Design a protein around this ligand. Structure first.
Ligand SMILES: CCCCCCCC/C=C/CCCCCCCC(=O)OC[C@H](O)CO
Ligand SMILES: CCCCCCCC/C=C/CCCCCCCC(=O)OC[C@H](O)CO
Ligand SMILES: CCCCCCCC/C=C/CCCCCCCC(=O)OC[C@H](O)CO
Ligand SMILES: CCCCCCCC/C=C\CCCCCCCC(=O)OC[C@H](O)CO
Ligand SMILES: CCCCCCCC/C=C\CCCCCCCC(=O)OC[C@H](O)CO
Ligand SMILES: CCCCCCCC/C=C\CCCCCCCC(=O)OC[C@H](O)CO
Ligand SMILES: C[C@H](O)CC[C@@H](C)O
Lengths: 133, 301
């Protein structure tokens, strides 16, 4: 499986973005999908994960703000990001675990076992108020 | 009058202890080298459970490496390894029993914390914290086992046979409480909390249920008999074959408690990582490296 991320760009503090994780040639049915982010100079941080069984997990930093989901046919994985703040500025990546019930138990450890990742998508949370200060 | 219990006690040491320790040695050595080499070859990023499990395996290997000496001394009825190795072997045997149940206590707390915080955001969920805790388990257990040194006064006898029984019974009873019963109830406590979390919303419960079962079943007969054995050595204890019978019952329970070091590598396959699948895959990669020539594949293609 080959992954590719969509969505993401500039958003104002308080704004929303919907990221997409597609597997261009096949279904993400038998896979667990994880959303990870990395800010400059900082360590890769797990944000959200979805199991093959549809179970969802969220980090303490994005809970009650983010929602991970699979589409109707379950081909794509979405990451709805609401009430975005400057601290959410990072390159967002998705990863796929072929053991669908494994990844979301321990996403930050089990990500180290995964070979399938996307190229990443830049998410930038900034206001014109900060830019012109 | 008690010659039957005496003949039985000799037979139990000569044939039962040496055969049961011999099986534990094979199973334990193979299982622990498999998972140890499995971690050193497959695991590149360790979490808290990985650190404790690895530590649990070092504790087991430390004890299992002494078994060939015990097996020979029992089979021949004579300790030829001297005083120092007798002391150091008695220490690693008890350090294994007590660090084992503590390592499992800490894995159970890790599994509970991971259930609530899967992204390991809390300080107690970090591998650097696991390393410090692991070191503290080694320091605490060493200090719990150290008072046994005072009981050595008067070949290589079991701790329950040497020293003043009045003081030894108190120490044994405190060591049963601090080393076995308190870590066991702590696991039971964490078992209950996991259930409450799940009922409010089965795979993470496996490890804790199994650890409570394995330790309850393996350590209870040994710990009852060790305390009964020491109590039976008191002047106030009744006369007769009771003392000799208790000696025999206590001997039966010892390899049952030490089965821990051969069966506890099973916890490596209960942490949700698909370690077994990683073991076969890596083994297949070493088998496929024989036929495939990657040094020629890159050069020509
Ligand atoms: C003589 C063999 C020693 C046996 C010692 C008893 C403890 C079991 C672990 C052994 C490690 C070596 C076996 C590695 C192969 C995979 C083991 C396995 O799959 O068993 C765990 C099971 O998955 C749980 O649900
Ligand atoms: C990599 C896999 C390795 C697998 C192989 C097993 C691991 C090594 C330990 C074996 C048990 C030790 C047995 C040696 C017992 C010697 C005891 C001793 O120290 O010597 C006594 C003294 O010389 C007399 O007075
Ligand atoms: C729960 C499982 C734990 C495992 C074991 C729990 C047993 C508890 C206590 C046993 C004391 C042993 C009783 C003492 C032996 C018999 C008493 C007696 O009068 O001995 C005379 C002798 O047997 C003439 O042949
Ligand atoms: C005979 C008595 C034995 C005494 C033994 C006391 C040791 C306990 C202290 C610390 C943990 C030791 C093991 C530390 C594991 C090192 C590997 C690690 O944690 O690094 C992970 C990394 O990401 C790549 O594997
Ligand atoms: C990481 C800690 C590793 C090893 C601790 C080894 C320290 C050894 C301290 C010796 C304790 C001792 O001798 O205990 C007596 C016991 O009663 C035996 O008969
Ligand atoms: C685990 C918690 C350890 C605390 C236990 C204290 C028990 C009281 C005994 C004091 C320590 C042993 C020294 C002693 O009483 O003397 C031994 C005597 O010579 C016999 O042969
Ligand atoms: C499914 C199981 O609990 C994971 C660990 C084994 C496969 O090694």
């Amino acid at each position: 499986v080959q992954l590719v991320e969509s969505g993401g760009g500039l958003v104002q503090p308080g704004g929303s973005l919907r990221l997409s994780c597609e597997a261009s040639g096949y279904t993400l049915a038998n896979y667990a999908i994880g959303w990870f982010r990395q800010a400059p100079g900082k360590e890769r941080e797990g944000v959200s994960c979805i199991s093959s069984g549809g179970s969802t997990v969220y980090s303490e930093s994005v809970k009650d703000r983010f929602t991970i989901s699979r589409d109707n046919a379950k081909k794509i994985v979405y990451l709805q990001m609401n009430s975005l703040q400057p601290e959410d500025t990072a390159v967002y990546y998705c990863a796929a675990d072929p053991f669908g019930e494994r990844l979301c138990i321990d996403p930050n450890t089990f990500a180290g076992y995964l070979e399938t990742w996307g190229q990443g998508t830049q998410v930038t949370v900034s206001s014109l108020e900060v830019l012109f200060q | 009058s008690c010659e039957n219990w005496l003949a039985l006690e000799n037979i139990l040491k000569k044939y039962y202890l040496s055969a049961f320790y011999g099986i534990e040695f094979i199973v334990g050595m193979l299982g622990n080298f498999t998972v140890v080499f499995g971690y050193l070859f497959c695991m590149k990023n360790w979490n808290s459970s990985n650190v404790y499990l690895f530590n649990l395996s070092i504790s087991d290997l430390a004890f299992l490496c002494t078994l060939p000496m015990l097996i020979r001394s029992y089979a021949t009825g004579n300790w030829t390894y001297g005083d120092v190795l007798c002391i150091s072997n008695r220490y690693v045997l008890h350090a294994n029993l007590y660090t084992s149940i503590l390592f499992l206590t800490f894995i159970s707390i890790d599994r509970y914390l991971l259930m609530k915080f899967p992204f390991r955001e809390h300080i107690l969920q970090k591998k650097e914290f696991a390393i410090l805790i692991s070191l503290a388990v080694w320091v605490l257990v060493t200090l719990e086992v150290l008072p046994m040194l005072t009981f050595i006064t008067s070949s290589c006898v079991d701790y329950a046979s040497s020293g003043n029984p009045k003081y030894s019974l108190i120490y044994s009873l405190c060591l049963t409480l601090l080393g076995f019963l308190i870590p066991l109830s702590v696991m039971c406590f964490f078992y209950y909390k996991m259930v409450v979390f799940l009922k409010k919303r089965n795979k993470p419960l496996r490890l804790v249920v199994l650890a409570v079962v394995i330790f309850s079943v393996l350590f209870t007969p040994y710990h009852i008999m060790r305390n009964v054995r020491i109590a039976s050595r008191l002047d106030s204890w009744p006369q007769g074959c009771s003392q000799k019978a208790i000696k025999c019952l206590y001997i039966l329970t010892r390899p049952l408690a030490f089965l821990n070091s051969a069966v506890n590598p099973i916890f490596y396959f209960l942490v949700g990582d698909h370690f077994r699948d990683m073991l076969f895959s890596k083994l297949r990669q070493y088998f496929k490296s024989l036929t495939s020539f990657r040094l020629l594949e890159v050069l020509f293609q």
